[PDB]
């Protein structure tokens, strides 16, 4: 409801944030299960689903 | 011989099924 009130009657209804949500699906929705960086590996395995 | 192998060293070809944006 907060989002609806903030963006009530946007370009049409939102038309903007619904666009960046698909981009925010990044760092996510990939066959990659754990992000490696040097010797530090962060495994987003329990939350992936 | 290659044909009957299909049905000679043959490489194993593999492909996967995944899902993205629920497709």
């Amino acid at each position: 409801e907060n989002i609806y009130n903030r963006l009530g009657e946007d370009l049409n209804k939102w038309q903007a944030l619904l666009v960046q949500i698909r981009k925010a699906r990044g760092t996510f929705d990939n066959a990659e299960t754990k992000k490696e960086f040097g010797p530090v590996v962060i495994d987003y395995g329990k939350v992936q689903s | 011989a290659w044909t009957q192998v299909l049905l000679p060293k043959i490489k194993n070809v593999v492909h996967e099924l995944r899902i993205t944006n629920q497709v």
Side-chain angles (χ1 to χ4, degrees):
Chain A
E1 172 72 12
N2 190 5
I3 291 275
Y4 301 165
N5 299 141
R6 287 184 184 178
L7 277 298
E9 192 62 27
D10 207 4
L11 296 94
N12 195 337
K13 190 44 185 184
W14 295 272
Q15 183 54 256
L17 64 92
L18 193 142
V19 193
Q20 292 90 21
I21 287 302
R22 177 166 267 276
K23 320 329 191 293
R25 263 177 56 198
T27 76
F28 170 75
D29 201 1
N30 51 2
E32 281 269 43
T33 66
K34 50 150 184 54
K35 178 250 177 175
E36 180 269 353
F37 183 77
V40 170
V41 286
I42 190 167
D43 189 359
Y44 46 102
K46 305 318 169 72
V47 299
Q48 175 64 262
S49 163
Chain B
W2 191 94
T3 304
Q4 68 91 23
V5 159
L6 265 292
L7 210 56
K9 207 273 168 183
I10 182 169
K11 195 261 179 186
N12 187 6
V13 62
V14 58
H15 72 269
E16 69 190 7
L17 310 167
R18 73 179 68 188
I19 186 165
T20 180
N21 60 63
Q22 203 54 227
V23 165

